[PDB]
Specification:
Chains A, C: Belongs to the phosphofructokinase type A (PFKA) family. PPi-dependent PFK group II subfamily. Atypical ATP-dependent clade 'X' sub-subfamily. The structure is a homotetramer. Chain A is of the alpha/beta class and 440 residues long. Chain A has helices at residues 99-114, 131-134, 142-145, 165-175, 186-202, 228-247, 265-274, 289-299, 334-347, 364-368, 374-392, 412-415, 427-435; strands spanning 3-7, 24-25, 31-32, 50-52, 68-71, 77-78, 86-91, 118-122, 138-140, 179-184, 207-212, 252-258, 279-281, 305-311, 357-361, 395-396, 398-403, 406-411, 418-422. The complex binds sodium ion (4 copies).
Chain lengths: 440, 422, 440, 422
Amino acid sequence: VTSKLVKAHRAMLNSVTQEDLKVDRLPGADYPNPSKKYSSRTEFRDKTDYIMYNPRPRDNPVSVSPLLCELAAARSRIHFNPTETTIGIVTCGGICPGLNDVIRSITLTGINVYNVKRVIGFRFGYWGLSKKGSQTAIELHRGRVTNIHHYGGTILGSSRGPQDPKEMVDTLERLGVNILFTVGGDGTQRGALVISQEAKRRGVDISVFGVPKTIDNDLSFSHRTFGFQTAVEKAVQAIRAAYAEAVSANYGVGVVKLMGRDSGFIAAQAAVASAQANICLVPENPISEQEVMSLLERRFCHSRSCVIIVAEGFGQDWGRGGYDASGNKKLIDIGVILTEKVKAFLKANKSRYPDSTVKYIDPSYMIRACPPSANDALFCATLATLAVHEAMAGATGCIIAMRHNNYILVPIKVATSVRRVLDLRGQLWRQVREITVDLG
Amino acid sequence: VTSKLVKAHRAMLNSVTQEDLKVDRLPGADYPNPSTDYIMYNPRPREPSSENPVSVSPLLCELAAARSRIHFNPTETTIGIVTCGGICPGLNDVIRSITLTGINVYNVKRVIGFRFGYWGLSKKGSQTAIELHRGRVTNIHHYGGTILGSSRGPQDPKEMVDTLERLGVNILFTVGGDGTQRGALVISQEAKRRGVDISVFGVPKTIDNDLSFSHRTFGFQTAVEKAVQAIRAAYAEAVSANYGVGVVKLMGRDSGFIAAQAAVASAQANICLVPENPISEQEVMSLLERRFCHSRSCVIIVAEGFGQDWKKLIDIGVILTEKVKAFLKANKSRYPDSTVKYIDPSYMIRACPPSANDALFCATLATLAVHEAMAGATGCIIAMRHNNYILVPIKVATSVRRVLDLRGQLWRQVREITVDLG
Amino acid sequence: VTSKLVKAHRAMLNSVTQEDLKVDRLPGADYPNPSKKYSSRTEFRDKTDYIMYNPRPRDNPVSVSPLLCELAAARSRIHFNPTETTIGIVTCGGICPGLNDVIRSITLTGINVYNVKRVIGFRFGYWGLSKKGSQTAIELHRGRVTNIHHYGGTILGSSRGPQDPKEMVDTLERLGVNILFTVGGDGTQRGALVISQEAKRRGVDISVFGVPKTIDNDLSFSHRTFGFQTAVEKAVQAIRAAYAEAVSANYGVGVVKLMGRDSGFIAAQAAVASAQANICLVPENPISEQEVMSLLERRFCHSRSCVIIVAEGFGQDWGRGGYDASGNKKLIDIGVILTEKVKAFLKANKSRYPDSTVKYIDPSYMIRACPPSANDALFCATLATLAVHEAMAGATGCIIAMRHNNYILVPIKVATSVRRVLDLRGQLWRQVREITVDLG
Amino acid sequence: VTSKLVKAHRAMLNSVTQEDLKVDRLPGADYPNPSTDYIMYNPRPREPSSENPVSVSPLLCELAAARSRIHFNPTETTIGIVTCGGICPGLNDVIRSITLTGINVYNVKRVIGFRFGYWGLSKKGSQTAIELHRGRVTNIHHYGGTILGSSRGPQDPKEMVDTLERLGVNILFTVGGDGTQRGALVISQEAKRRGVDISVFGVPKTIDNDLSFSHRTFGFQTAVEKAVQAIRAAYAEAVSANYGVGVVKLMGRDSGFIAAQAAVASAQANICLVPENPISEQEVMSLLERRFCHSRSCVIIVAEGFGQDWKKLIDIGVILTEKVKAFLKANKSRYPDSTVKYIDPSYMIRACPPSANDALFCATLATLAVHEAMAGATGCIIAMRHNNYILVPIKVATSVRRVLDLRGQLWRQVREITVDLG
Ligand code: NA
Ligand code: NA
Ligand code: NA
Ligand code: NA
């Protein structure tokens, strides 16, 4: 299998039990779905349906695991009174492709399908929910979100770091927010849980529901998250430039840094797609610099070109601690360090190689600020439509995720305790090995 | 979910058991690899009712993977490849990935590419067959179509096996629709009848994503991307004219997965006509009229398999356009000036290079095809289901087909986006 | 030289003399340019500067021609009172890439540089200037045109065909329009002259100034017109698909129809750029179908693939008269006719070719409704900025054009009397010959 | 216009006459082509003052074209090619177009590609030289960089001519900046000194469009396209942050043509810093402050040759970013939260495949290079001026360089778009 699950190095849960996977529901479902009609009643869920966590049998087959995930879907009875609920939205953390699509789909689903009273968009991450920031909140309506999905970034703006929980819920009450969608990563969702808790503490009828993005932070759970496919498309473009460079320099080395904090899916997938990576360094396979110089040496033994792909989360054990504004582990710029090591190594071996050039490409911002591909737009629209369905039906303290080709609901405590990482003995990483230089 | 199953026009099985899903393996695996876990067909249970959930279905699907003990003698194996049917993005990625994995992970004796489908296997065509080596395939993944060439239609299995036998092929990879796979079974059967040690392994091809026991086929994602661009052009044209209608034809012989996904992805379609929901021209005209009551523009997406009651179909893109023009003429009073632009981006969708993501996909399918074939698998196709890679016998894969579920979340989204009758 | 000039087959002028090239100027220049300051006075023209029509010497060198074109530029003295002038805009004919960029640049130049009183945008071509249509006129302001250049088509809309001249000028007076920009082709500009005349007839202080587009109509004068470069980019994309198809079919023929009414620049240039065209048919080289079947036969004599590029204006002498709604010559669909002839020819020769497939691609709408490339956006912005400069300075009855890498002003009567056509003995067409199949 | 001339760091001429512009031709044109018109340097006159206008300048430029009588014996000529300096889009198109025109229009005896610039011509590198035939170049136009490889720096002309003489090269095409062209003259001179019948013909290369007697160089248009995409990303980042600053570095060692054009094309730059307008960091900070008085976002475009007073330059993209962060820190009171993102898309601009339009351009320049070279032209470069193709001696082309005219219509447009001091 291509990937596997491992405990996060900052997990809220020590071990996941069926109970940890139980999704919280605001008390009560006193309203029929405004879209449910006798003819389409078949399309609305009456009871919570599940799907196995691990569809592997032990040897009808029984799962190797006791865990079950709740499937997301439109419900026949809902918690909030449609024409009276107020939806809020905020995008936190770094930007990535698809944020505007999520904002647009949440907005249009609320207005068109639920005839919601109003949709509010908070500016620049949690700051927009602070006493001072609340002042900048805007009203999102059909006309304001019609063509935003054609641009990168977020029209709401974003920012890293949490805000005083007391202040944030204060503004949510002050504005009459019933559902708050938190779009963002690990830290973003940790804040979401804190807000959810503060609200629960005050007895306020509020749901906080997360729409996660992962390529740019420590979070990594779903088989697919919005923005990933677009990042791969652009990563490949960066890899092609790196290859053009490398092949154009006698003993030239094209170094391209890609995203990937604890997982190397982006790098691993761009490496295979481009079919032009010679060395691929991911977080799951931490190797020393001597082994890297060794792979390069083996490459330059029968070639004048070398393209090295390197995930930002790789080689963190190579040098000079703590967490950034979003709560992610601080990182040393492996892109810069590696490029230097390579230039030092080829320097001290100027005799084995007459001339040598090392070129470093960092396409980070061009990958993050890129507009989404059509396939991500479809995914973004679907993640968002289901998020509105489940939150209107009272789901709270959870994120909408995608596992085994199905949309599920996962409590935030679980989502931030486990990580989806490359299985070095999986089909994907085996292709990268086949394609890249071999130690032996 | 978003799809449902329906008996394929030509099914070999009319019900499925667990044995039907077990993959056929050539006898013996003596050689060590130069370097069977199952998955549930249906991961849904039946309730958190204390202790490990049991699947609602008895069926299990075998997972594709490289094996430690393989069937063919690596250094002595010859690989053959043929691409049949209509072209779609990724064919070259499949050819390349197969070639390089056989040449680099197994050091096979040689790789052979037969030209223009099964034609290239018959006495006559066998002449064009070419030797595939690293250099010949190293950069073909930047082009649309197939370097080998393709063609529709079967040939005599006797002649084809004569060809395989003469060229000493141990593994023949058949890249094509269920039609080319049906022929693959007939080739596999003739060979076993002669006692020849050859595996016939298929790699599914369909832009439609019509293939059962599958959630995604290569080329399908590239198509949605290009279809969306086409819709962008249709919208541009439509919005630029007073009472303008932009008609866009999209792939979709028996299913409307591309049209539906492209409709949601673009969020610019006003009417989406698919083969799973045939409707009268009267209704289409009523939907168009409804749209024009509150707008001066209308984008109409139509799948090639729609309106056949208005071996295969007739050009519905032209018929529809013709009737929209007529409908507007007849009402030139209500709609003073009107314009109808027709867009058929068909060959521009299936003939373009693959998107990076499809490239990754094609490469993975191919790499896994060689791993399971080298380990004896035959009479099956490689496929992707529930985010995992599985082997599926041909008789099962070609017995059923995927189609839109007019009640799934995908179609529900296009219904909300499009004009409604009531 | 790559191209040449020939008389139009519907010309208003029988012969062009220096007088025909004299640009009309509304009477009076009583205002200093609101942007001219002592420091930048150097940047504003005091007198009309010229450039040779034909920079070829006879043998300081003297031109082979007596003709001189007026150069476009910001003027020190202008005709209209800035804060009081009202600018109007209308886009007519078929759409092409760059219309929104022209609308945006005209609008922002008027507002930002001239502090114009208002900019009006007329809907759907001249119809928007009819008594009924005038009703739909919109007000264009900074906020309405900020991001339109990112989309294909025209936000104002377009339409073919003229309207009653009496009605159009009636609305221009009724709305206080001082400058009317006519964006479009041959027919578009013929209407512009008619409006200009009607206005002159009434003694109204109005300027009608044209911003031409050509790829989709009979017009063809400048060395470069907006939208052309983008059309070539897309045409090449269509040619690649046609090649993928052709090479994938035994004796397969990829037929792709491109724009080009009286000129084959698009086809000729896409043919060379793509380096994958085997046969290229343009209007300047009308050949019979027998000669085409002959070229295909020579191609299939040593190959299984044939890509045929065909300009819409080619082979009009191949069959079944008059003008369309925009005033262009009616055309028979050479794309369809040619594809049929090829299928008939390969049919009657099924013996020489076992199997054969002919695939026809018509990327017309995908080329016309495409957003502009960045280079066209730059060109569009510059054409439009200069158009506003010259019209504010009283220029009327003319179009802004580009010749020999310079922006010039050309009276409409001249622009519609001559055509820029491929010189079959020029460097461009010689490359196409080198690349394509040879008769001998 | 939009550019002006300035003495090149290393000019050979310090004034120009008509003789300097006349192209040097090898003696004799005996053979018929297997299948000199001038243009005015300045097409402006001096007044419609009755009867045929006379140019303000005496200079005339020779127009490139295929000739009926040529210098070399077609079937016996050997062609050599080398790409030097930094890579830019279109190099492969140039190599390909040269190869195919020589092989298809002249049937030259052979085409040779020397590797990694002039290095490939020295005794040592001469070893890597490869034979260029149809198949080896038929699809290289889909890749960035150069297949031949490139390198900066000169080699000994003695060794290089030894190489040319040994391999029997009649024509050597030098693709590179004025540096590689200066070296081309030195190669042409050594060869004539030995009495060897060889033409050295240059094809100008510069993303900057710095080359004099030229209005456009290949690669320049592709760069503007990619630069605009980079600016799009910078804007996205900037608009997404409270008081965000997106800093984008663009090609432009001594000129800011790319930055200026990309600034207007995108219409999203708030500050455009180019080498033709050096300014203090104090002023840049004042422009940024002005912007932040009425907005929460700021895009700053900066050419690599700007701020050198803050053989070549130091990374101004990093310096500028460093100082913007410091400037904002020092004013964290006025700007509570601020963010500075730096974008250096340099290698992604020059290492990508060419846009179709540049492809057309490269092909045309190349095709014309072979036509004039085969007809004896030497010591010159092919160029495009006033929409026409002309031949220009190297000594003239490398004596002057184009630079932005801060008073032309291009720069005036970026001034209007960007924040103003007053
Ligand atoms: Na190299
Ligand atoms: Na419309
Ligand atoms: Na073919
Ligand atoms: Na901002």
